Design a protein around this ligand. Structure first.
Ligand code: A1CCP
Ligand code: MN
Ligand code: MN
Length: 269
């Protein structure tokens, strides 16, 4: 079976309880995770250990908090006490865990399921070939010995409009923001980097990225996490918002792909 789970955010107990609920069995089953494995919840260390141990039985995409953890680890960014990352950062296997984490994809595609996953979704300004090329470019910098330079360069809110003519720092920053920070778009598809509210609470003319028809969404289902204030609701057919806010006191959500059946684990917080 194929299971897809939204942002775990260190909620190790809830993740294991949910997987036991569906009798997740590596070798028979595959787990897709929308990223943001770490921060806020108490068990980022156990989450990373477990997910890495799954190997080919898990298909991960990196989220914005995963990238922030890598930035903290590399000395690029300051650790925030609220993220509860110190046990992971101080673990004897921190190097092993985080060097694995930075090699994971930003984008997962299953052609037989016609299924695409990224942390925040797929901007309507991207077709599939462009999404693939951009994911490959940023994954290459993240997997390289020089990844702290990219992590430092990734921070920024501009440019917010895609063009194949983009080059250099702006190209990487847009790619990173589209895959891991996107929520709202202007009517032309341009990213808004400030509003984090629910669609009903957002100011005009902002619309959810998935409310703007784009070539990937027209052919593929898209699963994503990230947007907790969406609460997994209000999406069109073929769009699966899996982040139901477990670390925030909401729930951890698991979708079984074969029958589109949902399983929910309440937050222990
Ligand atoms: N049910 C809810 N209703 C209304 N607001 C909610 C709800 N749940 C959480 N929030 C608030 O929503 C904010 C975004 O947190 P979040 O988990 O959605 O996203 P995260 O990526 O984990 C960090 P982020 O800095 O925001 O992401 P960005 O790429 O925009 O940079 C954060 O203040 C939360 O109090
Ligand atoms: Mn998140
Ligand atoms: Mn996120």
């Amino acid at each position: 079976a194929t299971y897809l789970i939204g942002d775990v955010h260190g909620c190790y107990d809830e993740l294991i309880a949910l997987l036991h609920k569906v009798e997740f069995t590596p070798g028979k089953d595959t787990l897709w995770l929308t990223g943001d494995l770490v921060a806020r919840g108490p068990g980022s260390l156990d989450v990373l250990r477990y997910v890495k141990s799954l190997g080919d039985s898990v298909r991960l995409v990196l989220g914005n908090h995963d990238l922030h953890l890598l930035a903290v680890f590399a000395g690029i960014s300051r650790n925030k006490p609220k993220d509860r990352l110190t046990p992971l950062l101080e673990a004897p296997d921190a190097d092993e865990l985080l060097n694995w984490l930075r090699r994971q994809p930003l984008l997962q595609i299953d052609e037989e399921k016609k299924l695409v996953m990224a942390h925040a979704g797929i901007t309507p300004q991207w077709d599939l070939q462009t999404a693939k090329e951009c994911a490959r470019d940023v994954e290459a910098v993240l997997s390289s010995d020089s990844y702290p330079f990219f992590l430092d360069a990734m921070y920024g809110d501009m440019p917010n409009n895609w063009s194949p003519e983009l080059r250099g720092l702006g190209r990487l920053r847009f790619i990173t923001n589209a895959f891991t920070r996107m929520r709202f778009c202007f009517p032309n598809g341009q990213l808004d980097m400030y509003s984090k509210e629910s669609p009903e609470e957002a100011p005009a003319p902002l619309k959810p990225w998935f409310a703007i028809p784009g070539p990937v969404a027209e052919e593929y289902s898209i699963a994503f996490g990230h947007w907790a204030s969406l609460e997994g609701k209000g999406t069109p057919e073929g769009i699966y918002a899996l982040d139901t806010g477990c670390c925030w006191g909401g729930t951890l959500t698991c979708l079984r792909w074969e029958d589109k059946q949902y399983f929910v684990q309440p937050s222990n917080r």
